């Protein structure tokens, strides 16, 4: 019998945000954003009803060292708390081993965020100096990228980050943005290009993306391994993309409402 599909996502603008009069609303009505629109498109196409719920620990998802327990949205799927994850969750090897991913609905890569004027234009620049600190988001693909990389420049950046004091790692993207904006150029943030270019179009328009991306990957709609939803969700993403819906949604939340020109 038909049952409401539990969707796990995360409060990360502009993917999922609280609507202005959210205190008055209930259920899915409380939220708005790219993934809120995407979730509606996928549901309509796959013919199911859903319930959006913000991940409890507010994390994307990593396997805890020692306990070996997955947290974040990935954990929700692994331990059976949610039927599907619709958010800017990166497709990775270690995640693909425990959960399923549809083909990408958005392409991206790790990038460098700086406060305008900062004397840095590449990862190599960051790795060769010590005056400007830099870090990443915790519990996700970005931190794991530097921890696993065998590439010289990235390995050197990891070696420095992992033992920096005070910590250069943040719990949420907003925490990293605020750290860049209030550090007078003494902090650079490593985050995915999607998020970097989004913040580049927001007041006070004081941040900027420098250099090219360090890698190339994508976000995928995830489901518990072997879930019956997988096939239809994948086809839905491919169709939505071919119809131009996805390009339309990104303009809607990124550029249409741009605040810096
Ligand atoms: C969004 C976002 O932007 N930079 C990042 O590290 C992230 C999280 C990343 N998508 C993950 O799955 O861990």
Q: Ligand 1 center to residue 161 CA distance, Å?
A: 17
Distance 171 CA to ligand 1 centre (A): 11
Rounded to whole angstroms, how far apart are CA atoms 217 and 90? 7
Query: Residue 28's closest CA among 64, 2, 56, 53?
Result: 53
Number of neighbouring beta carbons within 10 Å of residue 97: 9
* DSSP codes, 58-122: -----B-TTT--B-HHHHHHHTTS-SEE-SSPBP-HHHHTTEEE-S-SEEE-EEEEEETT-S--S
Q: How many CB atoms lie within 10 A of CB 161?
A: 20
Cα–Cα separations (whole angstroms), residue 133 to 88, 158, 183: 26, 12, 10
**Cβ(140) to ligand 1 under 6 A?**
yes
Non-local CB neighbours of 136 within 8 Å, separated by 6+ positions: 142, 143, 146, 161, 168, 169, 170, 176, 189, 190, 191
| Å from CA of 1 to ligand 1 middle | 35
Residues 6+ apart with CB under 8 A from 93: none
CB 228 within 8 A of CB 47: no
Residue 8 annotated as part of some ligand binding site: no
SS3 category, 53: strand
Contact at 8 Å (CB) between 60 and 72?
yes
Query: Counting every residue, how long is the chain?
Result: 261
Q: Which atom of ligand 1 is nearest to the CA of 95?
A: 12
Would the CA dihedral through 59, 61, 67, 69 be positive or negative? positive
CA distance 122 to 126: 7
CA distance 131 to 185: 10
Pairing mode, strands 106-108 and 217-219 = antiparallel
- Identify which of 251, 235, 234, 249 has the alpha carbon closest to the alpha carbon of residue 37: 249
Give the 3-state secondary structure of residue 170: strand
- CA neighbor of 62 nearest in space, from 138, 168, 151, 165: 138
CA distance 180 to 7: 32
Q: Which domains does the chain have, with CATH numbers?
A: 3-108+218-257 (3.40.190.10), 109-217 (3.40.190.10)
Closest CA to 46 of 163, 221, 182, 260: 221
* Rounded Cα distance, 6 and 85, in Å: 8
DSSP 189: E
Write the CB contacts of 162 (distance below 8 Å, at least 6 apart in sequence).
Answer: 147
**CA-to-CA dists, residue 104 to 92, 164, 193, angstroms:** 11, 34, 15
190 lines ligand 1 (CB under 6 A): no
- Runs of H (alpha helix) within the chain: 34-46, 72-78, 93-96, 123-127, 141-148, 152-161, 173-181, 193-199, 230-242, 245-250
Nearest alpha carbon to residue 137 among 180, 105, 107:
180
Lookup result for tokens 């900062």? 118
Q: How far apart are the CA of 194 and the centre of ligand 1, in A?
A: 9
User: Under 8 Å CB-to-CB from 108, ≥6 apart: which residues?
Assistant: 192, 193, 194, 213, 216, 217, 218, 219
What distance lies between CA 114 and its chain's CA centroid? 18
**190 sits in which H/E element:** strand 187-192
Q: How far apart are the first and last CA of the chain?
A: 50
Mutate to test the pocket of ligand 1, among 141, 170, 175 (most ligand atoms within 8 A of CB): 141
Count of C-beta atoms within a 10 Å radius of residue 251: 12
Say if residue 92 carries a ligand binding annotation: no
Q: What angle do CA 223, 225, 229 make, to 5 degrees?
A: 45
Q: Is 87 in the pocket of ligand 1 (CB under 6 A)?
A: no
**For residue 29, how far is its CA from the centre of ligand 1 (angstroms)?**
25
């Amino acid at each position: 019998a038909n049952k409401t599909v539990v969707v796990t996502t995360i409060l990360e603008s502009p993917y999922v945000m609280m609507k202005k009069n959210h205190e008055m609303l209930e259920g899915n009505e409380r939220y708005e954003g790219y993934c809120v629109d995407l979730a509606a498109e996928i549901a309509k196409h796959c013919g199911f009803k859903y319930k959006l719920t913000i991940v409890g620990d507010g994390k994307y998802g990593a396997r805890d060292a020692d306990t070996k327990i997955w947290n974040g949205m990935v954990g929700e799927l692994v331990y059976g708390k949610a039927d599907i994850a619709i958010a800017p969750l990166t497709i990775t090897y270690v995640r693909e081993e425990v959960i399923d991913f549809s083909k990408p609905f958005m392409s991206l890569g790790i990038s460098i965020m700086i406060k305008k004027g900062t004397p840095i234009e590449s990862a190599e620049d960051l790795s060769k100096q010590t005056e400007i600190a830099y870090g990443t988001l915790d519990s996700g693909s970005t931190k794991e990228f530097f921890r696993r990389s065998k590439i010289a420049v990235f390995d050197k950046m990891w070696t420095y980050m992992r033992s920096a004091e005070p910590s250069v790692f943040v719990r949420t993207t907003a925490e990293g943005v605020a750290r860049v904006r209030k550090s007078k150029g003494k902090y650079a943030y490593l985050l995915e290009s999607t998020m970097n270019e989004y913040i580049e179009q927001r007041k006070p328009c004081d941040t900027m993306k420098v250099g090219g991306n360090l890698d190339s990957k994508g976000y995928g709609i995830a489901t518990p391994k072997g879930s019956s939803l997988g096939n239809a969700v994948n086809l839905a993403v491919l169709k939505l993309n071919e119809q131009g819906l996805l390009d339309k949604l990104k303009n809607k939340w990124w550029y249409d409402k741009g605040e810096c020109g």
